[PDB]
């Protein structure tokens, strides 16, 4: 059975998430923003300018707030990349979280890391694994928002496979 210890590890080049696709979340906002932007998609889309917000406009969720992405390829996560919204926004997430998985339900909690809303892309120094499913999560005790928006989420890591 498996643990957790020390590593060294390269830092990795980032991921084409071209294949990708978020496969569930717990809210998204599909019209207050943009009538294309603001959806869960934007996360993994490419696109600087599509964001995804929390449901705002017209009702919004209790945290905590979270999106599964399958990565369609098993990869050795190396960082994680968070392009905030920025750029002066009311954009009050503290903290986020991450999990990854090979296979959809068994889940191991990558870290745990404070969050800024700085124009500039966000580097999380991750628990590297191998692993198809990344789930951002926003935690309900980080002191954490109902609003949360996101532009990016990017991958640092290997293929392996
Ligand atoms: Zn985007």
């Given at each position: 059975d498996t643990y957790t210890g020390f590593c060294i590890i390269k830092e990795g080049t980032k991921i084409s998430k071209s294949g990708?696709?978020?496969?569930?979340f717990t809210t998204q906002e599909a019209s207050g923003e943009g009538a294309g932007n603001g959806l869960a998609k934007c996360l993994i889309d490419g696109d600087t300018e599509t964001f995804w917000h929390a449901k705002w406009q017209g009702g919004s969720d209790p945290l905590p707030y979270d999106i599964v992405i399958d990565m369609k390829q098993n990869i050795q996560i190396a960082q994680v990349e968070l392009l905030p919204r920025g750029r002066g926004s009311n954009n009050p997430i503290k903290v986020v979280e991450f999990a990854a998985s090979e296979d959809n339900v068994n889940w191991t909690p990558i870290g745990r890391f404070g969050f800024t809303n700085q124009d500039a892309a966000l580097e999380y120094y991750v628990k590297s694994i191998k692993a198809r499913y990344i789930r951002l999560t926003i935690?309900?005790?980080?002191?954490?928002?109902?609003?949360?928006?996101?532009?990016?989420?990017?991958?640092?890591?290997?293929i392996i496979n």
């Open positions: 990708w696709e978020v496969l569930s935690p309900d005790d980080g002191g954490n928002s109902t609003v949360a928006a996101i532009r990016e989420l990017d991958v640092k890591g290997t």
